[PDB]
Amino acid sequence: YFLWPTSNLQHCAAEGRANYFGNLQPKGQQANSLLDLMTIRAFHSKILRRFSLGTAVGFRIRKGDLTDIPAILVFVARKVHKKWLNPAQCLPAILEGPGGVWCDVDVVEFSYYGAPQMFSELVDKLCGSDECIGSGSQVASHETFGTLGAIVKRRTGNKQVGFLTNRHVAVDLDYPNQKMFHPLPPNLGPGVYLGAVERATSFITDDVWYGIYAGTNPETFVRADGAFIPFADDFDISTVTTVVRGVGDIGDVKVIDLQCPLNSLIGRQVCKVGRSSGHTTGTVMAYALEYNDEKGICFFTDILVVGENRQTFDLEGDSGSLIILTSQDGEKPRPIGIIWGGTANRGRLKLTSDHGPENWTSGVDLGRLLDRLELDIIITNESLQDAVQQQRFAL
Amino acid sequence: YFLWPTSNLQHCAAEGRANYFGNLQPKGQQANSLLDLMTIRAFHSKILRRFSLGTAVGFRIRKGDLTDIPAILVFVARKVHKKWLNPAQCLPAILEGPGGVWCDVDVVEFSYYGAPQMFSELVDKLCGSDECIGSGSQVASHETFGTLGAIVKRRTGNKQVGFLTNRHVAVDLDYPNQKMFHPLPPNLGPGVYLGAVERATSFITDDVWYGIYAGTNPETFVRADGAFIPFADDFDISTVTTVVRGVGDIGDVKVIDLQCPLNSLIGRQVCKVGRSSGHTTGTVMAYALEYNDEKGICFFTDILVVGENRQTFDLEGDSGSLIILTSQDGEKPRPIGIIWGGTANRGRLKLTSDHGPENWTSGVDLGRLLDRLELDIIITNESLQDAVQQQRFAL
Amino acid sequence: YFLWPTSNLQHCAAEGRANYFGNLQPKGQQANSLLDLMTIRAFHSKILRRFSLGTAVGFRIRKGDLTDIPAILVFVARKVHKKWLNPAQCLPAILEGPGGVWCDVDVVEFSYYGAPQMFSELVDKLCGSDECIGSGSQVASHETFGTLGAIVKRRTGNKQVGFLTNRHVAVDLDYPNQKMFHPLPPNLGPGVYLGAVERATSFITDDVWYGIYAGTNPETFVRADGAFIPFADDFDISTVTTVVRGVGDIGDVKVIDLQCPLNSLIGRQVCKVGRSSGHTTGTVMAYALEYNDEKGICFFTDILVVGENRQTFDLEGDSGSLIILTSQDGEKPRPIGIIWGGTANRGRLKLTSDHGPENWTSGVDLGRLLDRLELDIIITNESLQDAVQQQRFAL
Amino acid sequence: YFLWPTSNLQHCAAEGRANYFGNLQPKGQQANSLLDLMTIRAFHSKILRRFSLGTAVGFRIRKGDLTDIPAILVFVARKVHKKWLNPAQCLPAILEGPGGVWCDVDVVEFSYYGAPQMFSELVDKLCGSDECIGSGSQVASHETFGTLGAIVKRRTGNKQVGFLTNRHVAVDLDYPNQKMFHPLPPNLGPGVYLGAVERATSFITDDVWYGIYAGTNPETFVRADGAFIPFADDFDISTVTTVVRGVGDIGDVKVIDLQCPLNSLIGRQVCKVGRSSGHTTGTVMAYALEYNDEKGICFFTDILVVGENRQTFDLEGDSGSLIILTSQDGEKPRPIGIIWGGTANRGRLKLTSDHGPENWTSGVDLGRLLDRLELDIIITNESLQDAVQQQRFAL
Numbered sequence A, B, C, D: 001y002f003l004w005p006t007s008n009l010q011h012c013a014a015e016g017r018a019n020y021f022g023n024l025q026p027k028g029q030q031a032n033s034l035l036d037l038m039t040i041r042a043f044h045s046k047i048l049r050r051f052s053l054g055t056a057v058g059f060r061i062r063k064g065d066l067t068d069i070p071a072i073l074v075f076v077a078r079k080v081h082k083k084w085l086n087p088a089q090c091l092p093a094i095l096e097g098p099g100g101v102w103c104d105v106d107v108v109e110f111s112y113y114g115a116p117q118m119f120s121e122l123v124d125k126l127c128g129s130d131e132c133i134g135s136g137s138q139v140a141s142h143e144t145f146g147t148l149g150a151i152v153k154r155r156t157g158n159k160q161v162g163f164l165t166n167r168h169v170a171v172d173l174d175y176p177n178q179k180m181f182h183p184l185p186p187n188l189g190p191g192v193y194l195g196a197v198e199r200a201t202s203f204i205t206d207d208v209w210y211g212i213y214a215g216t217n218p219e220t221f222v223r224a225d226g227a228f229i230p231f232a233d234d235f236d237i238s239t240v241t242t243v244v245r246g247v248g249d250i251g252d253v254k255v256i257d258l259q260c261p262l263n264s265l266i267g268r269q270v271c272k273v274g275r276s277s278g279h280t281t282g283t284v285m286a287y288a289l290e291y292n293d294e295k296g297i298c299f300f301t302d303i304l305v306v307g308e309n310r311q312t313f314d315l316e317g318d319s320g321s322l323i324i325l326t327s328q329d330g331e332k333p334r335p336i337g338i339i340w341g342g343t344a345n346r347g348r349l350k351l352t353s354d355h356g357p358e359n360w361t362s363g364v365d366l367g368r369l370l371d372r373l374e375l376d377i378i379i380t381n382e383s384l385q386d387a388v389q390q391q392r393f394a395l
Ligand SMILES: Nc1ncnc2c1ncn2[C@@H]1O[C@H](COP(=O)(O)OP(=O)(O)OP(=O)(O)O)[C@@H](O)[C@H]1O
Pocket: A051, A052, A060, A061, A062, A063, A064, A076, A078, A079, A080, A081, A082, A083, A085, A089, A090, A091, A105, A106, A107, A108
C-alpha cells in the first residue's frame, strides 16, 4: 500500500531549509552555473512570484534569440511596455544573491495548455509496423498510450531488463496492475503484452532531486514522473532494439551538473523520437521550471524545450520520449531527459515578433530519474544480450 | 404502400444459397475475374470476418501502389507487424477457392466516416448560375440536397424523361411526395420544380444484383440506392443538357462484367462531376465492398474510389454523381457508377506512409442500377429531343 | 422497389378536388356529424390557416370542459383577449358551410413536442416478464422499440397471423428487413424474433382515407402509419394472447363513421394499454387534426386524446398502442385507433386555468387502417387458434 | 516511490490458485456460510459470467423481499421471462459446488452509475456548523470532499491518532501530499488543516483479503480503498469526538466471518452517517460483489446496501462513511464497513415492481480494511484521550 512522510521528518526537513535561507539573508561575481541561478531565484522568489506565471533559469532571450547571458527567466501572461506597468509591478533587471553572485532577469510571455498525429514512415514503424521495439516506439496502457523512452536495466536485485517511460503514460493509480502493450491494448487493437510497471516515481523533493534547496517553499517537489516496465518472461526479448530510430546509436546518460557552465546544457540543440511527431529537433531554452500552484506547493520540471525551425517539438502522446543532446563534436548523442507527461506539460511561449507564439515542452532530468529509479540505460545491442544473460542465471 | 418478402420465398432463397455453398465445401489456376475473387471471398468469409472491418476484391496494394495482382482486400482498423499479432489473428496471404482457383490477400488500414464546399466557376454553374440542367447539377429536396447523376429515360410504359440521383438525396421515407428542386427548395432559396421521384431502389439481394451468391450470409444485400425523377410537365425541358460539364459528351453505360479481366475495372482512372467538389479524378481501387454490420446482415457497395493526386474524390453533397471512366484510347467516356449516399458512404484509407491516410468513396454499379430501375441514360442532346418527342405522343 | 404517383393521375385527382370546391363556392341547419364539420373546415381553410397552429373538429371547449357544441377547433400558439388582437386576426365564432350547414369555432392554445418510463407490474409484464404476447406488449426493432397494437390476420392471400403496430416503431426505410423482437433486439438484450414487417402504410390521401375531400389543398395526406408483422414460422404461436391486459377481452373494431352524431366519438372516454405508461384513460377531444407544414402539404391525423384525471395519456414509446373505447353500457370494449408515432405525434394543450397545460396524443383511425392494410383483429383466443389452423393448411 | 509485484511471486500465486481449482474439478449439504457461497460461485464463474452484469452472494430475492435462502445473486441488465430467453442464456436455479455443497441462483436486474445535497440540522453540523469532529463529518481534499469514517489509531509504531476515510476522497495520486480539511480546503472556503494521508490501501488480492480464492481469475482484486489521516501536531485534538452523531456511541468493529451463518450479515439492517445525506438506514442485501471488467481483471467490493423504506442509502459525497449494524438486541451498534468511493460505487437495482428500481451502495469490509491498514477505531472519548496520551510520550 501507499505511504507518505508523516508530520515528523517533514518539520525536520522544513527546518533544514528555513535555516539555510535564514542565515544568508554589480561589483560582484556574475552567476555562471545553474547552482548560482537557482540560488538567486530561491533567495528572490517572494518578489518573483508577485506578478509572474512562473520562473526558470537559463540564457536571456532578447529580440527572440538567446544572448548567452545568465539570467532568471520570469514568465508572464502578457508582457507590456514598462510605461504601462505599475512601478511596483515592474520587474528588476538585476538580482543579487548571497555572496554577491548576481544575474539578469528575463521577462517572457508564457502560457500553459493543461491536460494533454502526423504521418511518416518512421512514425508508422514506431506505431507498430516495425519488426523491433526500441526507443520511440508506441507503448499503450488500457486507457493511455505514449512513447517508449529507453531500454533500461535495474542496477540491483534481479537486474531485470525493461524500458522506461512516463508515469502518466504507463501508470494509472485506479487500476491494480499497469500492463503495457506496444501497438495498442487488446481492447483497442492488436498488440503484445510488453510487461507491467514494477516501480514508478511521481514526486521527489528538491533537496533529494537536485541536492540543494531550489526554493524557499517547504513544499517544493519535482515533477519527475518515470515508470520502469520490466519485460515479461513470455515477451520476445529478441525483438528489443537499443538503436534509437531516427538518430541511431546513443551514448550513456549525460548527467546535468549544477556546477557546470550554463552553455553545457542551456541553448544546446536536442533531438527526440516520439510516437506522435516522430523525429524532431529543439533547443533547451530554460532549466528547472518553477511553477507555483494556487494551493501553495512549488512544482519543478527540469528541462524546457522549444522546437527548432519554429516547428513544434512534441505533440500529445509524445510523452515519455528521450530528450537527446545532438552530436556536439562528432561523438555519440547522449540522452539528458524524458518528455514529461501530465497537466501543463506543454504550452505556448513568445520568443519572436512577426510570428505566432512558440510551443514549449517540459522534460525530466534523465540522470537523476535513473538514479532515483536505480536503472541503467542499455545503449548497445551486444550489451542488451549480456544484460538478458545476466538476468537469466540470476534467477 | 410498402411490401417486404415474407417467410416464404426467403427460405426458398436461403437453401438455394446454402446448397450452392455446401456442395463445394498454389498449383491451381489463379483468379483473374471478379467472379473468381468474390467466389473465394464467399467461401472464406468466416475466417475473413474475424478481425476485419470489411472485405473487397481488387488488385493488391503493396508499398501504397496497385500491383496488378488479383487479391482479396481485407480491411483492418489498424495494421501492425505480424510480430505483434497473435498467430490466430494473422491473416493468410493465400486463399483457396473451389476448383483450385486462388488469389492473394491484401491487408489495408481502414475506417468509416458515418452519416454524411470548394469554389470554382464549374461548381457555381452546377449550384445554380448555369443556363442548363445536366449531370453534376445540384438537386435539392426539402431537407437534403445532392448531385444530379444523369439524364435518363424509362424503357417501358410512359417512357418518361427524367434524371437519376441518389435515393438518400432525393427520397425521404417520412414525407408523402419526394419533390426535387435544382438550386434549392422554395423554403431555402430560389429554384424551380424539376419533378418528383416516381421510382427508387433501396436494397437488392446479391443473387439478383450480381447474379451470383457473393456471400454465405442468407441476409446479403447490395446498397444500390438510386431514385428516378421524371421531369414535370410544366418544367422547361429545353433547359436540360446531356453534356456532362467538365468532361463533355459521354457514351453509354459500361456494364461491369464479373467474367472480364480485373484490369478492365480495377485500377482504371475515373472522373466525377458533382457539387461542392466540381470535377475530380480518382482510381477504382476495389470492387464489391463487403461490409458486415453488428446485426448480422451483409451489406454490399459496388465501387471503391480513391481520389487521384492524393486529393479527395468527393465531399458531402457529391452523392448521386456519375462515376465515369476516363478516355481509355480516345473514345467517348462512359459512366460506370453513381456515388452512393448514406451512412459510411465515404471514409479514410491508408495506402502510403510519409503522408496522411487517403479518402475513399463508395459507388453503386450504374448498369445494374439502371437494369433494376429500367432506365436508359440519354447521352446526346439530339436523342434527348427524340425521347421527349416519344413521350409527348405516347400520352 | 418504391413507387409514387406520377404527374398523371395526380392532376386528375387534383381536378376532382378543385371541381368539388369550385361549384359550391344562423338560420340554417347546424352541423351535427363529422362530415359537416370537415366540410365547413375545408370550405373555410384559407381564413383558418391565417393565424393558427392547426385545425380540428370536435366539441367546443369552454372554461376547460367540453360543451357538446359542434365546432371547428382552431389551434393557436398563444390565446389572448380580442382587445389585444388585430380585427383581421380575430377569428369568427360562426362559420357557414355550403347548403347553410354551420358550426361554431373554438380557439385552443396549442403546442407540439417534436420527435418522440413509469413502473408497475403490468408495465413490467408488457416489457418482458410475462408468459404471453399480446396487445400492449413491447415490440422492438434494431434501433426503435414501441408497443404491440393488436393481434391481426390478413383477409386475403396466405391469411397470415401477426400483429399490428406503428410504422415508425417497426419500419426503418434505411434497412433491408424490419425484424421484430419482443423484449429487446439481440444487440440490446434478451429477446425472441417475433417476425418481420411484410406490409406497412405511411401516407394515404384524404379522398381515399375518409372518402371525402377534407381540405382544399391538392396535397392532402393522412398520417396513417401502421405496419403488419406476421408471426414467424419458428415463433411460438402458443404464447400469443388476444386478451388486452388491463382491460380484458375486447370487441371488433368500432369504425368511425363521418355520418354519425359527434357524441358517438368526440368526448367518449378511451383507455389504452401501451408501454412506458401501462393502462391509461383519456377523452377524445378532437377528430381529424389538420396540420399544415411550411412546405405546403396538408397533414391529417385522426384522433386527438387528452389524458383523463389531468394525467398524461401516453409517453414516448407508447406509440403503436390500441386506443380503445371504454365500456359504454356494459358491452365489450372496442378499439377505435392506434397511437401514432412520429414527429409531433404528441404535444401540450391548454384546457383549464389554475393548472399547467395538458398533454395531447394523436391517433390513427383503426378501422380505416385495417381496411387499407386488409387485416382483421383477432379478439378471441379461440379465434386465434382457428386463424392459425386456417393458415397452416392454406400453405 | 511506487512498487508492484513482478512476474515472479505472481505466477507463484497464480499456480497456487490454479492448483486449488484443478484438483476439485440436491442430495448434498446446502450452503450456509459466505465461504460456501463464494466457493460455489468461484467453481461456476465461467457459466455465470456469460450473460451477467456481475455476481454476488446473499439471500435470494423473490417478489422483491429476502427469502432467507442461501443463493448466488446473478446480476443482469434486463431480466425477462425464460419463454423469451435462449435456452443457452437461461441460468440454472441450482449450482453444485465441490463436496456436494449447493445453493440456489437469484437473477436481479442491475445497473451501474459510473463516476460519482440534503438539508437537515445534522447535515449542517457534519458540513461545518458543529463544535466537534467525528464520524460523519465532512472531510475535503483540494479537489474532492467526502465523509470522515471513524476515529482510528495506529496499532504499531508511533501509534498516531487520526481518522479513516475513503481513498478516493482523501488521496489523489497526481499531487505530492494529500492534505485534508474539514469544512472545505482554503481555496474553496473556511476550514483548518486536519492532517495529511500517511497510508492508504487501493487494491488487495482476494487470497490476502478474504483468506480464500474468491474466483478462478488469477487477476482477482478487492476494491478496498481506505486512507488513514493522522491528526496534525498543531490540530486541536480536543475538538475530536468519538460519538457518531445520529446513532450515538458505537462498539468495536464486527469482523465479517466467512464461516458464520448468512443471517449474521446478510439481511441485517444497517445505518450510516454521511455528509451528503445525513443519517440513513439500509439492509445488507448481498456480500462480495464480483465485477468483471472488459479488460479481464476481477474486481470485488464487500458490502451491498439498499436503502430502507425505498429511500436511497447514500448520495454522491457520502463515500467514506461507516456502515454500522444497528442495535440487534439492545447492545452497542458496531461498524462493519466503509462506504466505497470510485467509479460504479453505486447504481440502480430492481427488487419490487409497482415502483421504480432501487438504489444500491457498495461498501468495504471495515475489519479487514483495518487489519490491512493496522488501525483500531477509537469508540470512547475517554479512550481517545488515552490514545493521545500514549502518542505524546511515545515521541
Ligand atoms: N510584471 C510584469 N508584467 C508584464 N510585463 C513586465 C513585467 N515586468 C516587466 N515587464 C516588461 O518586461 C520588460 C523586460 O523584458 P526583458 O527582460 O525580456 O528584455 P530583453 O530580454 O532585454 O528584451 P526583449 O523584450 O526584446 O526580449 C520590461 O521592460 C517591461 O516592459
